[PDB]
UniProtKB/Swiss-Prot annotation:
It comes from Conus radiatus. Negative results: does not have effect on sodium channels Nav1.1/SCN1A, Nav1.3/SCN3A, Nav1.4/SCN4A, Nav1.5/SCN5A and on potassium channels Kv7.2/KCNQ2, Kv7.3/KCNQ3, Kv1.2/KCNA2, Kv1.3/KCNA3, Kv1.4/KCNA4, Kv1.5/KCNA5 and Kv1.6/KCNA6. It comes from the Eukaryota. This is Iota-conotoxin RXIA. The modification D-phenylalanine is found at X44. The cysteine framework is XI (C-C-CC-CC-C-C).
Length: 46
């Protein structure tokens, strides 16, 4: 089955259900260098 991930801009409270980072009021991927939110590191590998 597919995973739970939406696109960016989608505003929400947590990033877990988004392939980026839910910040101020939008799912933004730019959150892994200057702003703490969700480390998008290639850890979930196979």
């Amino acid at each position: 089955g597919p995973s739970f991930c939406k696109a960016d801009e989608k505003p929400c409270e947590y990033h877990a259900d988004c392939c980026n980072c839910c910040l101020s009021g939008i799912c933004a991927p730019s959150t892994n260098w200057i702003l703490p939110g969700c480390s998008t590191s290639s850890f979930x590998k196979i």
